[model samples]
Target: DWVPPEVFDLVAEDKARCMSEHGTTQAQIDDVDKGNLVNEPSITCYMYCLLEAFSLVDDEANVDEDIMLGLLPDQLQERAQSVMGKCLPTSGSDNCNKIYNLAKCVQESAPDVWFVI
Candidate 1:
């Protein structure tokens, strides 16, 4: 009801690609799902990569909700607004803090969505 099947595949592929390419383990993904963000370079970079794949962030590492919503279906765009309402540094430019905020928001704001991914 919240997300479509195509978006599901997109999220899944991006997640798998990050783990395979960035050396991110399932445990690390689990940790992010639980809102426990790691500062490790691989983890943060992995998160960055996923966000990029979703087009949620820009090359400069900015979390512009406008751009994100364009990529999302209307239903998910609404949910994402709630999930990322306060996701910070607006630029998402900082490696450490952005995922810390984004991942936690994913878990806290939309656990169902996070778990599905």
Candidate 2:
């Protein structure tokens, strides 16, 4: 939901590609978008796919805070920075898990700040 209208088409295209590549169902996306995250790779990898598509994170799933801050709306940059400060350097057993962890962290700090395209 935080995604701006001008970028919706780009986000949608990325989301479609990622969802297909990761075998993520719409239900999974809907569930996670509302904060009901699961540990499944289907959804977690989908998150990674989306982030990577936007260059928000590197190959190792490390978030690029500057890129993220730049993408956010002006009003949310500070809040996003705060959330990122606490949530990153993303860590977990694998790339998918790392993104899942990031999602959880983001959810804890700001429920309304996150949503899948």
Candidate 3:
């Protein structure tokens, strides 16, 4: 029996906002300019946790689709794009695709394992 959970919605919303804001943050932008990915353990841990939490939601519920389609405010979304423009692999790179697929896999397989760290 599949049951959709509200927690997925909450996690999605938070993650979207966080990602947008982080993209625009001065420190993050500076890190990107320095050719650094946000590879900090804490950031990776948080991201993994969010991914895991969302995965626990029912597979039949389309939570991932909902989250992806939910639009961030135009301004923030644009800002995120701008930030990415200054970064390596420029959004459509193989690395980006790999990360996306990995997230998808985690979401599909074990939504409950929030932190891979």
Predicted model with the maximum TM-score: 2
TM-score of each: 0.62, 0.90, 0.27
Q: Over the stretch 2-110, how does candidate 1's per-residue lDDT look in tens digits?
A: 5567776668867888778778887886677566776776677787788777777777667766766676666566776776666555434475456655666666667
Deviating ranges (above 4 Å) for candidate 1:
1-8, 11-13, 70-79, 89-93, 105-116
Q: What's the count of clashing pairs in each model shown?
A: 1, 0, 5
Per-residue lDDT for 115 in model 1? 32
Cα error, candidate 1, residue 42 (Å): 2.1
Tens-place lDDT digits, model 2, residues 1-117: 655677777688888889899899999988976779989999999989998998988889988888878877889888887888898899999889998988998998986656456
Give candidate 3 regions above 4 Å deviation.
Answer: 1-9, 12-43, 51-71, 88-117
Q: Distance (Å) between predicted and true CA of 2, model 3?
A: 32
In terms of TM-score, which candidate is stronger, 1 or 2? 2
lDDT of 2 at 38: 88
Which is the leading candidate under lDDT? Answer: 2
Output the lDDT of residue 117, model 3.
Answer: 15
